[PDB]
Design a protein around this ligand. Structure first.
Ligand SMILES: O=P(O)(O)OC[C@H]1O[C@H](O)[C@@H](O)[C@@H](O)[C@@H]1O
Ligand SMILES: O=P(O)(O)OC[C@H]1O[C@H](O)[C@@H](O)[C@@H](O)[C@@H]1O
Ligand SMILES: [Zn+2]
Ligand SMILES: [Zn+2]
Lengths: 188, 188
Protein backbone atom coordinates (compact mmCIF):
# COMPACT_ATOMS: atom_id res chain seq x y z
CA UNK A 1 0.00 0.00 0.00
CA UNK A 2 0.84 3.74 0.11
CA UNK A 3 2.52 5.05 3.31
CA UNK A 4 2.68 8.64 4.49
CA UNK A 5 6.04 10.30 5.12
CA UNK A 6 7.26 10.54 8.73
CA UNK A 7 8.56 14.00 9.60
CA UNK A 8 9.92 16.11 12.42
CA UNK A 9 9.10 19.77 13.07
CA UNK A 10 10.74 22.16 15.50
CA UNK A 11 8.46 23.74 18.09
CA UNK A 12 9.70 27.01 19.60
CA UNK A 13 9.02 26.81 23.35
CA UNK A 14 9.49 30.59 23.71
CA UNK A 15 6.98 31.56 21.00
CA UNK A 16 4.93 28.41 20.36
CA UNK A 17 5.57 28.75 16.61
CA UNK A 18 5.58 25.71 14.29
CA UNK A 19 6.93 26.64 10.83
CA UNK A 20 4.87 25.25 7.93
CA UNK A 21 1.81 24.63 10.13
CA UNK A 22 -1.69 25.99 9.53
CA UNK A 23 -1.84 29.23 11.57
CA UNK A 24 -5.18 30.57 12.87
CA UNK A 25 -5.65 33.81 14.82
CA UNK A 26 -8.60 34.52 17.11
CA UNK A 27 -9.16 38.18 17.97
CA UNK A 28 -11.71 39.41 20.48
CA UNK A 29 -14.20 40.13 17.61
CA UNK A 30 -14.14 36.37 16.84
CA UNK A 31 -15.51 35.73 20.32
CA UNK A 32 -18.91 37.39 20.55
CA UNK A 33 -21.19 35.78 23.16
CA UNK A 34 -18.28 34.13 24.95
CA UNK A 35 -17.43 36.49 27.83
CA UNK A 36 -19.70 37.40 30.79
CA UNK A 37 -19.15 41.17 30.54
CA UNK A 38 -20.48 42.00 27.02
CA UNK A 39 -20.08 45.79 27.37
CA UNK A 40 -16.43 45.26 28.35
CA UNK A 41 -16.18 42.93 25.35
CA UNK A 42 -17.75 45.53 23.04
CA UNK A 43 -15.54 48.42 24.24
CA UNK A 44 -12.37 46.32 23.89
CA UNK A 45 -13.26 45.24 20.31
CA UNK A 46 -13.95 48.92 19.44
CA UNK A 47 -10.70 50.25 21.01
CA UNK A 48 -8.15 47.65 19.97
CA UNK A 49 -9.69 44.25 19.10
CA UNK A 50 -6.69 42.33 20.57
CA UNK A 51 -5.45 38.86 19.65
CA UNK A 52 -6.72 36.34 22.20
CA UNK A 53 -4.86 33.32 20.83
CA UNK A 54 -2.90 31.88 17.89
CA UNK A 55 -2.98 28.21 16.82
CA UNK A 56 -0.31 26.39 14.76
CA UNK A 57 -1.91 23.12 13.65
CA UNK A 58 -0.46 20.03 11.95
CA UNK A 59 -3.48 18.03 10.82
CA UNK A 60 -4.01 14.73 9.01
CA UNK A 61 -7.12 13.56 7.19
CA UNK A 62 -9.93 12.55 9.56
CA UNK A 63 -9.21 8.82 9.91
CA UNK A 64 -9.53 6.41 12.84
CA UNK A 65 -6.20 5.79 14.55
CA UNK A 66 -4.33 8.83 13.20
CA UNK A 67 -3.15 11.87 15.19
CA UNK A 68 -3.13 15.67 14.94
CA UNK A 69 -1.04 18.09 16.95
CA UNK A 70 -1.13 21.84 17.49
CA UNK A 71 0.43 24.50 19.65
CA UNK A 72 -1.67 27.36 20.95
CA UNK A 73 -0.39 30.75 22.10
CA UNK A 74 -2.92 32.24 24.54
CA UNK A 75 -2.18 35.93 25.17
CA UNK A 76 -2.50 37.47 28.64
CA UNK A 77 -5.56 39.64 29.26
CA UNK A 78 -9.02 40.12 30.74
CA UNK A 79 -12.49 40.99 29.43
CA UNK A 80 -13.67 42.87 32.49
CA UNK A 81 -12.54 40.60 35.34
CA UNK A 82 -12.55 37.46 33.19
CA UNK A 83 -9.22 36.04 31.95
CA UNK A 84 -8.59 35.44 28.21
CA UNK A 85 -9.47 31.89 27.13
CA UNK A 86 -9.94 29.64 24.09
CA UNK A 87 -13.46 29.21 22.65
CA UNK A 88 -13.68 25.63 23.96
CA UNK A 89 -15.24 22.61 22.29
CA UNK A 90 -16.44 19.06 22.58
CA UNK A 91 -15.21 16.67 19.92
CA UNK A 92 -17.50 15.78 17.01
CA UNK A 93 -16.69 12.15 17.77
CA UNK A 94 -17.64 12.66 21.37
CA UNK A 95 -15.54 9.88 22.95
CA UNK A 96 -12.20 11.17 21.57
CA UNK A 97 -9.65 12.05 24.29
CA UNK A 98 -6.89 14.69 24.18
CA UNK A 99 -3.45 15.30 25.70
CA UNK A 100 -2.07 18.80 26.50
CA UNK A 101 1.53 19.65 27.43
CA UNK A 102 2.11 23.05 29.05
CA UNK A 103 5.32 24.70 27.75
CA UNK A 104 5.39 28.34 28.93
CA UNK A 105 3.38 30.70 31.11
CA UNK A 106 0.72 30.15 33.71
CA UNK A 107 -2.85 29.00 33.28
CA UNK A 108 -5.15 26.05 33.43
CA UNK A 109 -7.94 24.11 31.85
CA UNK A 110 -11.70 24.18 32.28
CA UNK A 111 -13.40 20.90 31.37
CA UNK A 112 -17.05 19.87 31.41
CA UNK A 113 -19.28 16.87 30.64
CA UNK A 114 -22.50 17.02 28.57
CA UNK A 115 -24.29 17.15 31.98
CA UNK A 116 -22.52 20.48 32.64
CA UNK A 117 -20.30 19.40 35.55
CA UNK A 118 -17.02 21.34 35.41
CA UNK A 119 -13.44 20.70 36.47
CA UNK A 120 -10.51 23.13 36.82
CA UNK A 121 -6.90 21.92 36.38
CA UNK A 122 -3.94 24.30 36.99
CA UNK A 123 -1.22 24.33 34.32
CA UNK A 124 2.42 25.42 34.65
CA UNK A 125 5.33 24.57 32.33
CA UNK A 126 5.72 20.76 32.36
CA UNK A 127 2.07 20.02 33.32
CA UNK A 128 0.53 17.28 31.13
CA UNK A 129 -3.27 17.26 31.12
CA UNK A 130 -5.36 14.24 30.17
CA UNK A 131 -8.66 15.32 28.60
CA UNK A 132 -10.90 12.21 28.79
CA UNK A 133 -13.65 11.14 26.34
CA UNK A 134 -16.81 13.33 26.55
CA UNK A 135 -15.27 16.40 28.26
CA UNK A 136 -15.47 19.79 26.60
CA UNK A 137 -12.20 21.63 27.20
CA UNK A 138 -11.12 25.26 27.32
CA UNK A 139 -7.75 26.78 28.29
CA UNK A 140 -7.41 29.96 30.38
CA UNK A 141 -4.38 32.31 30.79
CA UNK A 142 -4.18 33.57 34.38
CA UNK A 143 -0.63 35.05 34.08
CA UNK A 144 1.19 38.04 32.57
CA UNK A 145 2.78 36.41 29.55
CA UNK A 146 1.58 34.10 26.75
CA UNK A 147 0.35 30.72 27.99
CA UNK A 148 1.85 28.29 25.49
CA UNK A 149 0.96 24.59 25.14
CA UNK A 150 1.05 21.71 22.71
CA UNK A 151 -2.08 19.58 22.19
CA UNK A 152 -2.21 16.07 20.67
CA UNK A 153 -5.64 14.76 19.57
CA UNK A 154 -7.18 12.11 17.26
CA UNK A 155 -7.29 13.18 13.60
CA UNK A 156 -11.02 12.25 13.55
CA UNK A 157 -12.02 13.97 16.84
CA UNK A 158 -13.27 17.08 15.10
CA UNK A 159 -14.63 20.14 16.86
CA UNK A 160 -18.11 20.82 18.24
CA UNK A 161 -18.25 24.55 19.21
CA UNK A 162 -22.03 25.22 19.22
CA UNK A 163 -23.20 24.17 22.71
CA UNK A 164 -20.31 26.10 24.34
CA UNK A 165 -20.81 29.15 22.07
CA UNK A 166 -24.40 29.46 23.36
CA UNK A 167 -24.18 28.53 27.08
CA UNK A 168 -20.46 28.68 27.93
CA UNK A 169 -18.95 26.79 30.83
CA UNK A 170 -20.68 26.38 34.21
CA UNK A 171 -17.56 27.88 35.87
CA UNK A 172 -15.73 31.12 35.00
CA UNK A 173 -12.15 32.15 35.83
CA UNK A 174 -11.80 35.75 37.01
CA UNK A 175 -9.60 38.15 38.93
CA UNK A 176 -11.26 39.64 41.99
CA UNK A 177 -9.41 41.57 44.75
CA UNK A 178 -5.96 40.87 43.22
CA UNK A 179 -6.76 37.16 43.30
CA UNK A 180 -7.47 34.41 40.73
CA UNK A 181 -10.88 32.81 41.42
CA UNK A 182 -12.70 29.90 39.79
CA UNK A 183 -16.39 30.54 40.43
CA UNK A 184 -19.86 29.58 39.22
CA UNK A 185 -20.81 31.23 35.95
CA UNK A 186 -23.58 33.79 36.72
CA UNK A 187 -25.24 33.17 33.31
CA UNK A 188 -25.49 29.38 33.91
CA UNK B 1 -23.26 7.83 32.55
CA UNK B 2 -19.65 6.90 33.27
CA UNK B 3 -17.21 9.76 32.76
CA UNK B 4 -13.52 9.40 33.62
CA UNK B 5 -11.99 12.16 35.72
CA UNK B 6 -9.65 14.62 33.96
CA UNK B 7 -6.20 14.94 35.54
CA UNK B 8 -2.95 16.88 35.30
CA UNK B 9 0.54 15.57 36.06
CA UNK B 10 3.87 17.37 36.32
CA UNK B 11 6.54 16.05 33.95
CA UNK B 12 10.10 17.13 34.80
CA UNK B 13 11.65 17.92 31.40
CA UNK B 14 15.11 17.55 33.05
CA UNK B 15 14.52 14.01 34.34
CA UNK B 16 11.51 12.76 32.35
CA UNK B 17 10.06 11.38 35.59
CA UNK B 18 6.26 11.24 35.76
CA UNK B 19 5.23 10.72 39.41
CA UNK B 20 2.57 8.00 39.69
CA UNK B 21 3.19 6.43 36.25
CA UNK B 22 3.79 2.75 35.48
CA UNK B 23 7.61 2.54 35.46
CA UNK B 24 9.33 0.05 33.14
CA UNK B 25 13.10 -0.56 33.23
CA UNK B 26 14.99 -2.17 30.33
CA UNK B 27 18.54 -3.37 30.93
CA UNK B 28 20.90 -4.55 28.22
CA UNK B 29 20.20 -8.16 29.28
CA UNK B 30 16.53 -7.65 28.26
CA UNK B 31 17.78 -6.88 24.75
CA UNK B 32 19.34 -10.14 23.54
CA UNK B 33 19.27 -10.46 19.75
CA UNK B 34 18.86 -6.71 19.22
CA UNK B 35 22.43 -5.50 18.67
CA UNK B 36 24.69 -6.31 15.69
CA UNK B 37 27.80 -6.92 17.82
CA UNK B 38 26.71 -10.02 19.82
CA UNK B 39 30.09 -10.44 21.56
CA UNK B 40 30.17 -6.78 22.58
CA UNK B 41 26.60 -7.16 23.90
CA UNK B 42 27.53 -10.25 25.95
CA UNK B 43 30.63 -8.49 27.35
CA UNK B 44 28.76 -5.34 28.38
CA UNK B 45 26.02 -7.48 30.01
CA UNK B 46 28.66 -9.42 32.01
CA UNK B 47 30.69 -6.31 32.92
CA UNK B 48 27.88 -3.87 33.74
CA UNK B 49 24.45 -4.75 32.26
CA UNK B 50 23.51 -1.08 32.13
CA UNK B 51 19.98 0.38 32.05
CA UNK B 52 19.34 1.21 28.36
CA UNK B 53 16.00 2.97 28.93
CA UNK B 54 13.25 3.64 31.46
CA UNK B 55 9.62 4.33 30.58
CA UNK B 56 7.05 6.25 32.62
CA UNK B 57 3.65 5.34 31.11
CA UNK B 58 0.14 6.72 31.78
CA UNK B 59 -2.26 4.31 30.08
CA UNK B 60 -6.02 4.02 29.67
CA UNK B 61 -8.17 1.03 28.75
CA UNK B 62 -7.76 -0.13 25.14
CA UNK B 63 -10.51 1.97 23.64
CA UNK B 64 -10.91 3.54 20.23
CA UNK B 65 -10.44 7.33 20.38
CA UNK B 66 -8.73 7.40 23.77
CA UNK B 67 -5.03 8.21 24.34
CA UNK B 68 -1.99 7.00 26.28
CA UNK B 69 1.18 8.97 27.00
CA UNK B 70 4.65 8.07 28.27
CA UNK B 71 8.05 9.64 28.78
CA UNK B 72 11.23 7.72 28.03
CA UNK B 73 14.74 8.22 29.37
CA UNK B 74 17.18 6.67 26.91
CA UNK B 75 20.63 6.46 28.48
CA UNK B 76 23.84 7.22 26.55
CA UNK B 77 25.98 4.30 25.42
CA UNK B 78 27.09 2.01 22.62
CA UNK B 79 27.19 -1.75 22.11
CA UNK B 80 30.32 -1.90 19.97
CA UNK B 81 29.86 1.03 17.58
CA UNK B 82 26.03 0.87 17.72
CA UNK B 83 24.32 3.54 19.86
CA UNK B 84 21.82 2.58 22.59
CA UNK B 85 18.23 2.43 21.37
CA UNK B 86 14.71 1.32 22.30
CA UNK B 87 13.58 -2.21 21.34
CA UNK B 88 11.23 -0.67 18.72
CA UNK B 89 7.80 -1.89 17.59
CA UNK B 90 4.92 -1.81 15.13
CA UNK B 91 1.51 -1.23 16.70
CA UNK B 92 -0.79 -4.26 17.14
CA UNK B 93 -3.43 -2.22 15.33
CA UNK B 94 -1.08 -1.29 12.48
CA UNK B 95 -2.78 1.91 11.27
CA UNK B 96 -2.28 3.69 14.62
CA UNK B 97 -0.05 6.82 14.54
CA UNK B 98 2.13 8.29 17.30
CA UNK B 99 3.49 11.76 18.23
CA UNK B 100 6.86 12.22 20.00
CA UNK B 101 8.14 15.42 21.65
CA UNK B 102 11.89 15.60 22.30
CA UNK B 103 12.71 17.17 25.66
CA UNK B 104 16.43 16.74 26.41
CA UNK B 105 19.66 15.38 24.90
CA UNK B 106 20.53 14.42 21.33
CA UNK B 107 19.01 11.50 19.48
CA UNK B 108 16.69 10.52 16.71
CA UNK B 109 14.14 8.06 15.45
CA UNK B 110 14.45 5.17 13.00
CA UNK B 111 11.22 4.35 11.20
CA UNK B 112 10.36 1.39 8.95
CA UNK B 113 7.41 0.12 6.85
CA UNK B 114 6.32 -3.55 6.81
CA UNK B 115 8.43 -3.72 3.58
CA UNK B 116 11.57 -2.49 5.35
CA UNK B 117 11.66 0.99 3.77
CA UNK B 118 13.63 2.98 6.36
CA UNK B 119 13.76 6.61 7.51
CA UNK B 120 15.87 8.60 10.00
CA UNK B 121 14.65 11.72 11.85
CA UNK B 122 17.04 13.85 13.93
CA UNK B 123 15.69 14.83 17.35
CA UNK B 124 16.84 17.67 19.61
CA UNK B 125 14.91 19.46 22.36
CA UNK B 126 11.73 20.92 20.86
CA UNK B 127 11.60 18.50 17.88
CA UNK B 128 8.13 16.98 17.35
CA UNK B 129 8.01 13.73 15.33
CA UNK B 130 4.98 12.44 13.46
CA UNK B 131 4.99 8.63 13.30
CA UNK B 132 2.42 7.73 10.58
CA UNK B 133 0.17 4.64 10.47
CA UNK B 134 2.05 1.40 9.60
CA UNK B 135 5.57 2.61 10.50
CA UNK B 136 7.64 0.67 13.06
CA UNK B 137 9.64 3.09 15.22
CA UNK B 138 12.77 3.04 17.38
CA UNK B 139 14.49 5.92 19.20
CA UNK B 140 18.29 6.23 19.34
CA UNK B 141 20.58 8.20 21.68
CA UNK B 142 23.54 9.61 19.73
CA UNK B 143 24.99 11.81 22.52
CA UNK B 144 26.74 11.50 25.88
CA UNK B 145 23.79 12.51 28.07
CA UNK B 146 20.25 11.03 28.50
CA UNK B 147 17.88 11.41 25.55
CA UNK B 148 14.46 12.28 27.04
CA UNK B 149 11.15 12.49 25.19
CA UNK B 150 7.38 12.23 25.58
CA UNK B 151 5.15 10.03 23.41
CA UNK B 152 1.37 10.21 22.92
CA UNK B 153 -0.28 7.22 21.23
CA UNK B 154 -3.76 5.75 20.73
CA UNK B 155 -4.88 3.67 23.71
CA UNK B 156 -5.78 0.74 21.41
CA UNK B 157 -2.51 0.87 19.42
CA UNK B 158 -0.86 -2.03 21.27
CA UNK B 159 2.72 -3.16 20.76
CA UNK B 160 4.15 -5.60 18.21
CA UNK B 161 7.80 -6.40 19.03
CA UNK B 162 8.18 -9.83 17.37
CA UNK B 163 9.23 -8.89 13.83
CA UNK B 164 11.76 -6.30 15.07
CA UNK B 165 13.05 -8.71 17.75
CA UNK B 166 13.97 -11.36 15.15
CA UNK B 167 14.91 -9.24 12.10
CA UNK B 168 15.69 -5.75 13.46
CA UNK B 169 15.67 -2.56 11.42
CA UNK B 170 17.10 -2.38 7.89
CA UNK B 171 19.29 0.53 9.02
CA UNK B 172 21.63 0.91 12.02
CA UNK B 173 22.99 4.00 13.76
CA UNK B 174 26.65 3.76 14.70
CA UNK B 175 29.70 5.83 15.59
CA UNK B 176 32.37 5.26 12.95
CA UNK B 177 35.54 7.38 12.65
CA UNK B 178 34.34 10.01 15.14
CA UNK B 179 30.98 10.61 13.43
CA UNK B 180 27.36 9.40 13.60
CA UNK B 181 26.34 7.34 10.57
CA UNK B 182 23.02 5.84 9.51
CA UNK B 183 24.13 2.81 7.48
CA UNK B 184 22.67 -0.44 6.17
CA UNK B 185 22.18 -3.16 8.77
CA UNK B 186 24.69 -5.86 7.65
CA UNK B 187 22.58 -8.55 9.37
CA UNK B 188 19.41 -7.61 7.41
O1 LIG C 1 -11.36 25.51 21.51
P1 LIG C 1 -10.60 26.04 20.32
O2 LIG C 1 -10.85 27.49 19.98
O3 LIG C 1 -10.61 25.10 19.14
O4 LIG C 1 -9.08 26.11 20.76
C1 LIG C 1 -8.42 24.92 21.15
C2 LIG C 1 -7.33 24.67 20.14
O5 LIG C 1 -6.17 24.42 20.96
C3 LIG C 1 -5.50 23.16 20.98
O6 LIG C 1 -4.21 23.35 20.36
C4 LIG C 1 -6.26 21.99 20.33
O7 LIG C 1 -7.22 21.42 21.25
C5 LIG C 1 -6.93 22.38 19.02
O8 LIG C 1 -7.73 21.28 18.56
C6 LIG C 1 -7.84 23.58 19.19
O9 LIG C 1 -8.14 24.16 17.91
O1 LIG D 1 8.24 -0.03 23.44
P1 LIG D 1 9.69 0.21 23.10
O2 LIG D 1 10.00 0.12 21.63
O3 LIG D 1 10.65 -0.56 23.96
O4 LIG D 1 9.90 1.79 23.43
C1 LIG D 1 9.62 2.35 24.72
C2 LIG D 1 8.39 3.28 24.74
O5 LIG D 1 8.64 4.49 23.99
C3 LIG D 1 7.59 5.48 23.99
O6 LIG D 1 7.54 6.19 25.24
C4 LIG D 1 6.21 4.89 23.64
O7 LIG D 1 6.10 4.63 22.23
C5 LIG D 1 5.91 3.60 24.41
O8 LIG D 1 4.71 3.00 23.89
C6 LIG D 1 7.08 2.62 24.28
O9 LIG D 1 6.79 1.44 25.03
ZN1 LIG E 1 -10.05 19.04 21.51
ZN1 LIG F 1 4.37 3.19 19.38
Amino acid sequence: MMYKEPFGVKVDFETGIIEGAKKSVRRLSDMEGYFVDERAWKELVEKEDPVVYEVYAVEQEEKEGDLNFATTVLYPGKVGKEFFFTKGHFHAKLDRAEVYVALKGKGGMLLQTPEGDAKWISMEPGTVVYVPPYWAHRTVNIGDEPFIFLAIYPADAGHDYGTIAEKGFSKIVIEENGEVKVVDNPRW
